[PDB]
Structure formats: structure tokens, C-alpha cells
Amino acid sequence: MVKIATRKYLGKQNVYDIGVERDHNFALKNGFIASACFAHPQALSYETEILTVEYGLLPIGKIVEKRIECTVYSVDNNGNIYTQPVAQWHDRGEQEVFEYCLEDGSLIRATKDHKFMTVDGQMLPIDEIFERELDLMRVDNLP
Amino acid sequence: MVKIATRKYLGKQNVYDIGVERDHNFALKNGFIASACFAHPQALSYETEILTVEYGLLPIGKIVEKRIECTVYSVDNNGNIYTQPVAQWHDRGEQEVFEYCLEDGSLIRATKDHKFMTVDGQMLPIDEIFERELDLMRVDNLP
Ligand SMILES: [Ca+2]
Ligand SMILES: [Ca+2]
Ligand SMILES: [Co+2]
């Protein structure tokens, strides 16, 4: 239940995504739920931290550059949390990145199409979440 | 196990997609497996027929325009076929559409980014499947 306070364009920066085999989402630092759909430019800045079972928070750019085998947290269509392994690692090259600062102080640096889960359980582009002043889903349950 | 023989640009045409809640794929006429990931421009021409449990083959443009409640066929990560209901209906407006004619005589008219399943079980843009002369997955099991 966290709105996005501000949006800032950072320019073109290297971005990254991962693929999973079950529900196409995974949890970031603080419990926000990013889409893992096969979608472009959708991708995340190097620093964006993914919660992994094995290592805790790791930057996605490190996970991708080193092809780290690890297990992420995901949400099913009934809202239950489960874990599943990373199945794909992609360096997506330079893309336009926007920095979204959230009302809880969190920062998300993503291509502005990147879908994230809102509190109703739906996936929307982060830029639309910002413009329409919607609340991001934040899973507080995670270890 | 069907390659794409030819590609033809059709110009801008209205296109459509659907959303599902389980695996993000669904079967078209003849058993080809289209992606239902939240992805843009990825969408299909009006005429593209989706196999439904209730009505048999229906054009996606009709399913979307009338918001037809129906059940599609999908493939899980182990290759098993199951059914699941349509959960979203989207008219995506005019987009660039390409006509792919397959070696079995099938036609797919889609935005050229549209992901489809290849015979290895992976999702790739249809234009890449064409250019790299890959084989599309074709489920022959369906009723
Ligand atoms: Ca992507
Ligand atoms: Ca789409
Ligand atoms: Co998806």
C-alpha cells in the first residue's frame, strides 16, 4: 500500500531482467512485486535488489551478469507467497530509465513500461501507477 | 513442428489480445501457442482464431469486442495441456501487422514482436522464429 511520490528521468542506462517458469512476478527489496513477463523494454537498473532465498537481497545486475542460480519470491493468483527458481538471465542493454521514489522512501529505477503489481492484484506499468496515483502492492511477509 | 515460410507486411490494422491467470499462453487454430504475457505491441489481428472449449474456434476480435466469457487451452511448463478462462479482453488499437504464412498453410497475422512457443518450449517473437527458421510448437491433441 505505497504510492509513488516522484518520477525522475535518469537517461539511458544498462538494464536487466530475469525469467521464471511459474507466475511471472518476483519480489524486490521491501516487498514490491515486479513483472517477469516476456516484455520489452521492461527491465530494471543494475542496482535493483531482488530478494533471494539463498543470498538475501542481491542486485539484479549481479544476478544477471554472473548468471546466479537462485530462488525468488512470487505471488500466485490468490495472493499466496511462494518461491521459485530463476530460469532466465538477460542483459537488455541500454534503455531509458526512470527513477520512481515511493512514499515509503523506496526507490525503483526501471524502464517506465515496467509492470508492477498494484494493491488490487493487477499488473500495471509503473509510469501509469505514478500518474494515476495508485498504490503498489507491498508484501511485508518476506524474510 | 512447423516453420514459417513467408512474411508479409499488411500495414496498420486493429489488433487485440486477451489475458489469462495461469500460464501466459493459449492455443490458436491448428494448435499454435501464442503468448498472453503483458506485453506491447504484442497483439493479434481480428480474424485470428482462438480455440475455446465452449464455442470452438472464435476470432479474437469477436471475443474481445463482445467480451466473450470463454475457456482457452494452455500448456504448462511440463508440456501438459489444460484449460483456463479468459480473464482480460483488450482492443489494442491500430498496430503494425505482419502476415506469416506457415509451411502447413496456416496463417498468423500478428504484431511482429508477438511471442509464440517454439518446439523446445520457449517463447520467442514470431519475427525471430521466421528469420531464424525455427519450428513453432503445434499441439495436435486439441478438440
Ligand atoms: Ca524484458
Ligand atoms: Ca499486448
Ligand atoms: Co507473462
Side-chain angles (χ1 to χ4, degrees):
Chain A
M1 195 75 45
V2 182
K3 298 190 180 65
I4 303 174
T6 62
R7 171 186 60 199
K8 173 183 178 181
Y9 181 52
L10 297 187
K12 297 175 186 179
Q13 313 281 343
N14 280 71
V15 293
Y16 305 86
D17 60 45
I18 51 162
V20 292
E21 309 214 328
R22 294 181 60 182
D23 291 287
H24 286 161
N25 65 66
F26 54 91
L28 307 188
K29 175 180 175 181
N30 288 343
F32 303 104
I33 302 300
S35 173
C37 279
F38 309 141
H40 178 89
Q42 169 174 286
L44 298 161
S45 75
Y46 184 105
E47 63 273 24
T48 306
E49 292 170 65
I50 297 174
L51 185 64
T52 72
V53 170
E54 295 90 352
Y55 309 109
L57 292 169
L58 293 180
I60 186 175
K62 190 185 212 177
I63 288 165
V64 166
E65 273 183 350
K66 303 313 190 154
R67 298 184 62 88
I68 301 190
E69 313 277 1
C70 57
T71 306
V72 299
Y73 295 81
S74 298
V75 53
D76 69 12
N77 43 337
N78 274 97
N80 306 134
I81 305 305
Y82 67 101
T83 59
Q84 62 172 319
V86 175
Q88 301 186 40
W89 304 259
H90 289 98
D91 179 342
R92 298 297 187 191
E94 275 197 343
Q95 308 287 339
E96 292 175 4
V97 171
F98 292 77
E99 178 174 284
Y100 295 91
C101 182
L102 281 51
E103 291 194 334
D104 73 342
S106 299
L107 292 168
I108 298 174
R109 297 172 181 143
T111 60
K112 65 172 164 55
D113 65 310
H114 205 305
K115 284 195 174 63
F116 275 80
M117 189 172 283
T118 45
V119 293
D120 60 349
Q122 303 306 136
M123 284 292 195
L124 286 174
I126 184 159
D127 203 56
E128 178 176 348
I129 299 172
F130 169 68
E131 298 203 331
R132 296 178 53 215
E133 303 184 41
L134 307 184
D135 273 277
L136 291 154
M137 183 80 80
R138 194 185 72 191
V139 181
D140 290 330
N141 309 38
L142 327 172
Chain B
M1 195 75 45
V2 182
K3 298 190 180 65
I4 303 174
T6 62
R7 171 186 60 199
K8 173 183 178 181
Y9 181 52
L10 297 187
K12 297 175 186 179
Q13 313 281 343
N14 280 71
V15 293
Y16 305 86
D17 60 45
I18 51 162
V20 292
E21 309 214 328
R22 294 181 60 182
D23 291 287
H24 286 161
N25 65 66
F26 54 91
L28 307 188
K29 175 180 175 181
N30 288 343
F32 303 104
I33 302 300
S35 173
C37 279
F38 309 141
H40 178 89
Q42 169 174 286
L44 298 161
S45 75
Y46 184 105
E47 63 273 24
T48 306
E49 292 170 65
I50 297 174
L51 185 64
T52 72
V53 170
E54 295 90 352
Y55 309 109
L57 292 169
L58 293 180
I60 186 175
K62 190 185 212 177
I63 288 165
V64 166
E65 273 183 350
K66 303 313 190 154
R67 298 184 62 88
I68 301 190
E69 313 277 1
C70 57
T71 306
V72 299
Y73 295 81
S74 298
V75 53
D76 69 12
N77 43 337
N78 274 97
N80 306 134
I81 305 305
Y82 67 101
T83 59
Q84 62 172 319
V86 175
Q88 301 186 40
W89 304 259
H90 289 98
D91 179 342
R92 298 297 187 191
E94 275 197 343
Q95 308 287 339
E96 292 175 4
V97 171
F98 292 77
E99 178 174 284
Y100 295 91
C101 182
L102 281 51
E103 291 194 334
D104 73 342
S106 299
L107 292 168
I108 298 174
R109 297 172 181 143
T111 60
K112 65 172 164 55
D113 65 310
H114 205 305
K115 284 195 174 63
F116 275 80
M117 189 172 283
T118 45
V119 293
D120 60 349
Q122 303 306 136
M123 284 292 195
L124 286 174
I126 184 159
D127 203 56
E128 178 176 348
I129 299 172
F130 169 68
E131 298 203 331
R132 296 178 53 215
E133 303 184 41
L134 307 184
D135 273 277
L136 291 154
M137 183 80 80
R138 194 185 72 191
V139 181
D140 290 330
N141 309 38
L142 327 172

